[PDB]
Assembly symmetry: C3
Homo-oligomer: 519 residues x 3
């Protein structure tokens, strides 16, 4: 296919504008980001918080309805991936960097400071509200988007694009018109900013880790961590060949290293306490699910707005911005699966992986805090993991391994996001241009680095603010995608013979009633 | 022309007239009896109300989710005679309107200011959740049960449009025409009269408060209430005896338009952002606390929630059970040809969402005022809350008048609809009843409401609530039996006969086989 | 023929326990305490997690397509009427345990509170009593009974725990060493769970005799006499070769339990109990997942001892009872569907337990609130009679409760012994009466051994040894889930579609790999 320049040029111009604003005009960019966060949070926290749970309800009911039997492909089709392989391939979609960053920080900071409507030093609350942001809502969003693309491209044979999934609502004219172009541009921009958030978190934490081992300098975030991890691997893996064979190796190394780190912290750490937190975390998450889903700026006597902006609305925006990439990824590896099976796997397997990960790491941190040891230290979120690792025997080698894992996650996430963006910018071609992929990867890495540099001391806050503002337009795209998906599922070939009969009988009944009214 | 059911008219008419005379000429005796009867009823049946109120919700969810959800309310492969949008629009009628207007400000504001048993004061989430508790799912679960029973009896099986006909599976045709069916219909008419009189009394009281606030009348004297009720009853009487159904549908459209206008005015001129924040908060805290409130009895809070329960939750239970004949028959009428699952889902969810939005807007504005220093509580009279809320907003002087007009139109339309259903139930389930019987029933409900308001005196809302609870207690058992009748009716469907006969035959064979095996050794 | 390879190890372990307990009491008690500490600290997480995984698993199995499978031949209707089947679920379950903890558990939760909650809270006191007795125990029993019933009726295998693992180990492991190990573990777990029940019954009977002033004070010789008398009546019933006396006792169990519950209901605070019914159910559904998430590091690392005393003990007790109740449920529930079986087994005993605990615990808590108090010296065994004597006419009801405990002793012994004889007779339903008598005597001896060894801390001894003996069978019950899923998936009604899916998926994988290789060009 050809390049959709009408969709590349707008998004690329927006990205260049954001980068120039952040780099050359740090103060103005930071002020604007703070003001836009204030306005967006105050005026649309209701939208984020309401539709986060509407997505979960919607995907659950879609799975449990008659559409669950539909198969993503030809009728009576069987899937191309084994169930074990299908489950394993979902690891590459999850947050390697997000988990590596927040596994220790989030449960520990919620244990220490508490959350709105709750007191400090509550393990159940800490683990439950860590599981709130990471288990069902993100993967309900991802299931919705991936199911939309899967039904559009496999069942109906349309192009693999976000705009195509809206064909039921806006028709073909809209899909090829200005509205389809707008949807595709918003998808590309949201993916860019959502991936740049992860790249910024990973670079920040890698710098902190290098400082922990005492091998770092000050400008390493810009001069080494970003540009090296981008150029020396991602470009040479993309531009050199269609498949560089390094992405597969790194995607397997991610699994191996994450398993090794989790097993180290599990065995060397307080194993019994972690095993106690498994059922405790799951039970206290299921108990507090709706209480946390109803936490708005009007909660805790109006004092929850700042916390929600810093913690919950940030995650809403982050997951919404991830939606296009993760949806395309899940759709690509789920052909032939049924809708019910797809939804169940996508919702539950990563939820369990996240639950276990947070159990190990947050539980070790909370147990240390309870005993008297404090991995908190200064309080930086990027230094908690290495403090936790160093607190355990043989922690130096594992800290180095954690830095290696962070670098591999950086490379893998950037490469996969660039692949999906290139596909979306090339009229839905599965194998997009290599140079378009490299350009989009450069753009994402540059945006993440620019957010970090503009934030400076408050790098994390600047990152979160720009992610929150950048994902506001795509929240409505996902909301309308729910409607488009329902309208597409209803108008399935298997249901048309029943729908015509229902329409005919309803018309007969309505005309009979109208005639009786005339009488 | 179905003959008049005099044997069902007289037992309910005599009770209504006895209540009117007793409450008018003997205000003190009537109030004392109502108070004592509330004490006894609440003490010895709050467990029944609270348990079966949630059993209704569970029963409806199970019925929709079970194999019965695919059955059509009519002949097989039938289709609805109303478009889905028209069905949803018609659902708004037969709701409260007057209850929603009366309580939208008062109830969440009251819970926020004073708290609820087992919880502390100044809790927005708890106030909104326990307001949603009384107005969203258990109400419409009860209405779905009754309307589904009536719809199945009348469309699928082709019986009369009655509540006794829904008990045929339990007591049979002889029972339906026997004394038990007559008793069920009498209780249905009594419950309709008292559930309607409660809303009419609330509307008259709030219109009096509005006239007092608008300065049209200096005070809301008893004669003011009498005049309001007389004028509104005269309007309803003219609408009915005129024999033309155009004016009533015009007033229904006006009710929808004016309710939307008031909601939009408070949403826009009020704290829009807080109103929108309270939507997810209200829903989440409702689903979080659902079973905590479902398990709230007089034994909660170390045995101290009895007075609060009788004031709010048991009163609502009685009110929503008293409405059950009217709202059930209304929903049954407009739901021809729908499947059981579709009927249940729409009836449960659409009104719940509308109530959620209404309470969010009005209660959230009141609570936002409370938090910011302003207090529309004033003297604390419930009837004066709404006009305190509107008069605290720019341009609200005219919207208070619009609120009074909306209350008047709600009064007229609700009286007409309830009286139409009552006339149906007193004429062997005729779809259209005699004009004079409908007029008489509507005037009787108005007279009961006026009697309650006047006998209450300085405490009118309390007397209204007490009489509502006492009058609705008998029909809780009718609804409970209707659950069994509905299950038996759905089980004995034509599509399920062959499978059931196969199972019965095989079961007899297996039982004789095991009896023989025991005989062996 | 006797499976001596299974009898001899179980007999050796049981006799070793008896010799250790009587001969060396200090050593036995020290080992029991140390083993309780170790197993609790290291596997309370396993107990707590899998107790709720069982509920999730059985609910999902009932909901899924497997719920349509019929236990037996296709179109085979059940042998017992639904009334008979429902009533037969009372013989299997817990009568002695219910009588022992009917008052003690809610009363002590109300008095002392539970981890993460304040004391003197009726809602939690009843919700966490319902937690330990309603859905987790019966989820375990339903899983085990369903596995046994499917293996023995659908597939025609022998009625054993070993034959239910055939999906995982083939007939080679079913008859190999692993099947023998599973059978031995099932026998030992049944012996020790039934011994825990019998020891509780003997303690309660001694407490009742002390209360009735028949004995001046309890003594070890009194417990020995009680256990000897009851097991002698048992041995006579078993060796007599006539089950008429046992059927009489099993009916007397229901009659007397219903009589006692109705007495406490009518003569106790009826309205408070009725209030507690919906309160208990609602607070159970509200707090279900908060109680399911209670671990050794809840309430700031202070719930370990409370969990070991209450929650982990009940988990171990149910897991040790699971072979018996599973075999019982499989025997009486042939021809049922998986969905019907699961729903009935989960819901009927849960409702019965809810009513029982509502009555007795609500009576105790209402006495505590009003000013009275049945706590007395704090002994768990003395609470029930302390509750009875507080009510008028309780002097006779104390002896009625003692008689009921004796009948429960005999009948529970006989059902457990019959299951053990079936296990040791290669799954033969008509178990040898001498093996049955030997197993019953061994159970009584183990219960007496735990009581005597514990002495003053008799209940602690019982619970410690029960947890230790039930720890091994937890993994068997966990593996039953996988074995049952493999049984159900590989069913004749699904094998054709499974073959079609396998072939199509192989074609799809071949296409994808060939396409990838082609594109790799
Ligand atoms: C924590 C919370 C938890 C909550 C959990 C919630 C979870 C939900 C689970 C959902 C599961 C669904 C699964 C089953 C689906 C099966 C349905 C189906 O299709 O079966 C056929 C079944 C029957 O079919 P039918 O007989 O043909 O029906 C006729 C159609 O109704 C009449 O035809 P039509 O005119 O509609 O035709 C239009 C056509 C296609 O439409 C078009 O013509 C499209 C035109 C193009 C528009 C542009 C689209 C492109 C936009 C993309 C986004 C871009 C953004 C970019 C951003 C840029 C920023 C810079 O659409 C359709 O195909 C019909 C579906 C329309 C759905 C309408 C529902 C509106 C909901 C309103 C309430 C909620 C709003 C929330 C507001 C927020 C605050 C609360 O369909 C229906 O169910 C239809 C009825 C649906 C309900 C209608 C409701 C009307 C208004 C309700 C208001 C009152 C209630 C709300 C609360 C109270 C407010 C006061
Ligand atoms: C105090 C509160 C509780 C405290 C907490 C404790 C928990 C409560 C204990 C519950 C324990 C579990 C259940 C045990 C019951 C076992 C028996 C049974 O019903 O199962 C066998 C049941 C019947 O089988 P069967 O015994 O073989 O029947 C044929 C025999 O030939 C039988 O031969 P037959 O045909 O001659 O049998 C007689 C009858 C056919 O049925 C019978 O066998 C007799 C009636 C059945 C007993 C029902 C027990 C279970 C339900 C509890 C009732 C209350 C709440 C639920 C309401 C019912 C909705 C299903 O047929 C007739 O000829 C009609 C005779 C008249 C019937 C009664 C009519 C009067 C109703 C009473 C109320 C009226 C006014 C006073 C109001 C009261 C003051 C508060 O078998 C089935 O499974 C059939 C299923 C039918 C369709 C299922 C779909 C509907 C279910 C919806 C879900 C409900 C949600 C509720 C959840 C709420 C949670 C908060
Ligand atoms: C320790 C680290 C790892 C832990 C990870 C946890 C893993 C859990 C993942 C759950 C399974 C995901 C993969 C499922 C693939 C197989 C298909 C499947 O399970 O779904 C079927 C769904 O089948 C059903 O019909 C519904 C069955 C319900 C199964 C529910 C199991 C999950 C229950 C979750 C409980 C709550 C968990 C905690 C939530 C936070 C498929 O339906 P179908 O349309 O193909 O029809 C098949 C058949 O005809 C039956 O329909
Ligand atoms: C919250 C506001 C935003 C909502 C966004 C919705 C986005 C999707 C829109 C898709 C268009 C259709 C919307 C209306 C759907 C109604 C439900 C529905 O269709 O249910 C189907 C699937 O049903 C389900 O499994 C459940 C449906 C969803 C309802 C459950 C929602 C739970 C919400 C509870 C909230 C708490 C209550 C108080 C607060 C409101 C089938 O049932 P039916 O009635 O259409 O047909 C029945 C029969 O087969 C004949 O057709
Ligand atoms: C604690 C008190 C008891 C529990 C109360 C809460 C219960 C909530 C959940 C109840 C779920 C019941 C769902 C029933 C769906 C039936 C589905 C169906 O089509 O039937 C199948 C499953 O069948 C069943 O299991 C039928 C059981 C239905 C009865 C359910 C009773 C609910 C509880 C009643 C007591 C309520 C007490 C409330 C007061 C506290 C087919 O199986 P079968 O062919 O063997 O069934 C034969 C039957 O005649 C077919 O209709």
């Amino acid at each position: 296919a050809s390049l959709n320049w009408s969709v590349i040029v707008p998004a690329l111009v927006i990205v260049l504008a954001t980068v120039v604003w952040g780099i050359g005009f740090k103060d103005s960019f930071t002020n604007f980001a703070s003001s836009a966060l204030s306005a967006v949070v105050d005026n649309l926290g209701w939208a984020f918080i309401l539709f986060g749970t509407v997505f979960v309800f919607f995907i659950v009911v879609i799975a449990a309805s008659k559409f669950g039997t539909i198969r993503l492909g030809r009728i009576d089709e069987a899937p191309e991936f084994r169930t074990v392989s299908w489950i394993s391939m979902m690891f590459a979609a999850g947050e390697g960097i997000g988990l590596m960053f927040y596994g220790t920080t989030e449960p520990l900071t919620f244990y220490r400071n508490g959350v709105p409507g709750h007191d400090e030093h509550n393990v159940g609350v800490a683990m439950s509200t860590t599981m709130f942001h990471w288990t069902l809502h993100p993967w309900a969003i991802y299931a919705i988007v991936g199911l939309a693309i899967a039904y559009s491209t496999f069942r109906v044979g349309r192009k693999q694009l976000l705009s195509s999934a809206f064909v039921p609502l806006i028709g073909e004219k809209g899909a090829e018109g200005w509205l389809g172009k707008l949807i595709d541009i918003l998808a590309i921009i949201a993916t860019v900013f959502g991936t740049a958030c992860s790249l910024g978190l990973g670079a920040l934490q890698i710098g902190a880790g290098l400082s922990a081992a005492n091998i770092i300098e000050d400008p390493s975030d810009w001069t080494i961590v970003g540009i090296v991890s981008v150029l020396t691997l991602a470009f040479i893996f993309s531009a050199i060949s269609g498949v560089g064979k390094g992405i597969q190796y790194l995607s397997n190394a991610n699994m191996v290293l994450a398993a090794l780190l989790a097993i180290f912290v599990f065995v060397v750490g307080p194993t019994v306490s972690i095993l106690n937190l498994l059922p405790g975390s799951i039970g206290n998450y299921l108990s507090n699910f709706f209480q946390m889903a109803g936490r708005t700026a009007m909660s805790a006597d109006g004092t929850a707005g700042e916390w929600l902006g810093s913690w919950t609305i940030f995650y809403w925006a982050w997951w919404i911005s991830w939606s296009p990439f993760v949806g395309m990824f899940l759709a690509r590896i789920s052909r032939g699966r049924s809708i019910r099976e797809f939804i169940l796997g996508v919702l539950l397997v990563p939820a369990g992986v996240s639950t276990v990960w947070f159990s190990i790491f947050g539980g070790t941190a909370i147990v240390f805090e309870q005993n008297g040891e404090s991995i908190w230290g200064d309080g930086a979120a990027e230094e908690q993991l290495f403090g936790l690792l160093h607190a355990l025997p043989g922690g130096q080698i594992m800290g180095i391994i954690a830095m290696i894992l962070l670098g591999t996650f950086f490379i893998t996430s950037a490469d996969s996001a660039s692949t999906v963006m290139g596909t979306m910018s090339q009229h839905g071609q599965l194998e997009a241009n290599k140079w378009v992929t490299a350009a989009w990867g450069v753009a994402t890495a540059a945006i993440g680095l620019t957010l970090l540099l503009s934030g400076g001391d408050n790098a994390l806050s600047n990152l979160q603010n720009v992610t929150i503002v950048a994902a506001t337009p795509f929240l409505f795209v996902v909301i309308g995608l729910m409607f488009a998906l329902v309208k597409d599922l209803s108008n399935d070939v298997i249901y048309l013979e029943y729908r015509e009969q229902q329409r005919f009988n309803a018309r007969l009944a309505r005309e009979r009633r109208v005639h009786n009214e005339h009488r």
